Design an enzyme around this catalytic site. Sequence first.
Site, PDB file in Angstrom:
ATOM      1  N   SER A  31       0.805  -1.222   0.000  1.00 41.79           N
ATOM      2  CA  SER A  31       0.000   0.000   0.000  1.00 41.79           C
ATOM      3  C   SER A  31       0.837   1.271   0.000  1.00 41.79           C
ATOM      4  O   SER A  31       0.267   2.357  -0.133  1.00 41.79           O
ATOM      5  CB  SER A  31      -0.947  -0.002   1.198  1.00 41.79           C
ATOM      6  OG  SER A  31      -1.915  -1.019   1.066  1.00 41.79           O
ATOM      7  N   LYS A  41       0.305   3.356  -3.145  1.00 46.43           N
ATOM      8  CA  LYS A  41      -0.810   4.274  -3.332  1.00 46.43           C
ATOM      9  C   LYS A  41      -0.317   5.712  -3.528  1.00 46.43           C
ATOM     10  O   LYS A  41      -1.056   6.560  -4.016  1.00 46.43           O
ATOM     11  CB  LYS A  41      -1.774   4.177  -2.145  1.00 46.43           C
ATOM     12  CG  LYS A  41      -2.528   2.847  -2.119  1.00 46.43           C
ATOM     13  CD  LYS A  41      -3.608   2.783  -1.063  1.00 46.43           C
ATOM     14  CE  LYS A  41      -4.447   1.517  -1.206  1.00 46.43           C
ATOM     15  NZ  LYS A  41      -3.680   0.270  -0.953  1.00 46.43           N
ATOM     16  N   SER A  56      -6.398   2.837   3.379  1.00 51.03           N
ATOM     17  CA  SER A  56      -5.704   1.912   2.473  1.00 51.03           C
ATOM     18  C   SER A  56      -6.701   1.052   1.695  1.00 51.03           C
ATOM     19  O   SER A  56      -6.664  -0.179   1.721  1.00 51.03           O
ATOM     20  CB  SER A  56      -4.707   1.026   3.231  1.00 51.03           C
ATOM     21  OG  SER A  56      -3.661   1.787   3.788  1.00 51.03           O
ATOM     22  N   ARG A  77       4.863  -0.506  13.314  1.00 48.96           N
ATOM     23  CA  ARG A  77       5.442   0.260  12.219  1.00 48.96           C
ATOM     24  C   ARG A  77       5.621   1.714  12.626  1.00 48.96           C
ATOM     25  O   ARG A  77       6.720   2.270  12.527  1.00 48.96           O
ATOM     26  CB  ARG A  77       4.554   0.151  10.985  1.00 48.96           C
ATOM     27  CG  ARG A  77       4.402  -1.266  10.455  1.00 48.96           C
ATOM     28  CD  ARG A  77       3.319  -1.335   9.378  1.00 48.96           C
ATOM     29  NE  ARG A  77       1.997  -0.987   9.905  1.00 48.96           N
ATOM     30  CZ  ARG A  77       0.887  -0.939   9.173  1.00 48.96           C
ATOM     31  NH1 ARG A  77       0.930  -1.210   7.878  1.00 48.96           N
ATOM     32  NH2 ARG A  77      -0.270  -0.606   9.728  1.00 48.96           N
TER      33      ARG A  77
HETATM   34  O1  Q4G Z   1      -2.576  -1.001   8.574  1.00 51.75           O
HETATM   35  C1  Q4G Z   1      -3.537  -0.435   7.998  1.00 51.75           C
HETATM   36  O2  Q4G Z   1      -3.673   0.809   7.894  1.00 51.75           O
HETATM   37  C2  Q4G Z   1      -4.605  -1.312   7.393  1.00 51.75           C
HETATM   38  C3  Q4G Z   1      -5.674  -0.756   6.702  1.00 51.75           C
HETATM   39  C4  Q4G Z   1      -6.650  -1.571   6.157  1.00 51.75           C
HETATM   40  C5  Q4G Z   1      -6.570  -2.946   6.300  1.00 51.75           C
HETATM   41  C6  Q4G Z   1      -5.511  -3.530   6.993  1.00 51.75           C
HETATM   42  C7  Q4G Z   1      -5.440  -4.998   7.189  1.00 51.75           C
HETATM   43  C8  Q4G Z   1      -5.383  -5.552   8.466  1.00 51.75           C
HETATM   44  C9  Q4G Z   1      -5.358  -6.924   8.643  1.00 51.75           C
HETATM   45  C10 Q4G Z   1      -5.387  -7.775   7.553  1.00 51.75           C
HETATM   46  C11 Q4G Z   1      -5.434  -7.214   6.311  1.00 51.75           C
HETATM   47  F1  Q4G Z   1      -5.447  -8.036   5.228  1.00 51.75           F
HETATM   48  C12 Q4G Z   1      -5.459  -5.861   6.098  1.00 51.75           C
HETATM   49  C13 Q4G Z   1      -4.533  -2.694   7.530  1.00 51.75           C
END
Ligand code: Q4G
Length: 242
Positions: free
Chosen positions: A47, A50, A95, A227
């Site tokens: 991501s 993006k 995201s 992170r």
């Molecule tokens: O870290 C983030 O901002 C984020 C945003 C959207 C979905 C996810 C996520 C969390 C757990 C499993 C997965 F496949 C996606 C993380």
Amino acid sequence: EWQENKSWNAHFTEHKSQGVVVLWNENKQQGFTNNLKRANQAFLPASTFKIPNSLIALDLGVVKDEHQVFKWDGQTRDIATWNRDHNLITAMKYSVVPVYQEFARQIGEARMSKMLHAFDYGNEDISGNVDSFWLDGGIRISATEQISFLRKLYHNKLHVSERSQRIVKQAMLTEANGDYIIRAKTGYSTRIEPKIGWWVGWVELDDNVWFFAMNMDMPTSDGLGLRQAITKEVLKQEKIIP
Ligand SMILES: O=C(O)c1cccc(-c2cccc(F)c2)c1
Ligand SMILES: [Cl-]
């Protein structure tokens, strides 16, 4: 000039993880990392892609502005925040992969490849499916290459209009207070080993800018908060933020 500070490794081992933080002092043109080797190892951008994807979509007119609404396609997905309408701001905040997959389809393979070469982005390789190559295709980028790309963006030097770059930098806004501003984007890569998390961006101070790029092992989603947490601990240790 680059200096390796392995004392930062404590921030990763104390959470029984492994990773790299890369810092760049814009005023002094000096870099810092805990692991020169891992700083130059290439991973899926996930991501963090993006950022370039938003820039290309804006510059080609695929996205009109940061207010354009991308309607939910009506398919219930497992991320609740994805099952709703979005604009560019919220799509990057949460995201929202499905929104950016449609961007890429409308961009198309040819224009995407051309633009990533113009950006000098990673290995510039879109091999794979046009709507998922940044998740399980052939594109790769290192932490040091992320910083190189972000520095161009900060200075409006990428080969897209100034407007496109200002809009994407707005969409990157993550935190702001009386002491600093952070513009950044997280990443979470699971489809190709090793599973990692990203956080890339920069810290705006009154009289300087510190760029940063980190990635770390992410065997489970339970550590995603590390992170930002680990990055900010490095920043505090180096007295960049209070
Ligand atoms: O870290 C983030 O901002 C984020 C945003 C959207 C979905 C996810 C996520 C969390 C757990 C499993 C997965 F496949 C996606 C993380
Ligand atoms: Cl802003």
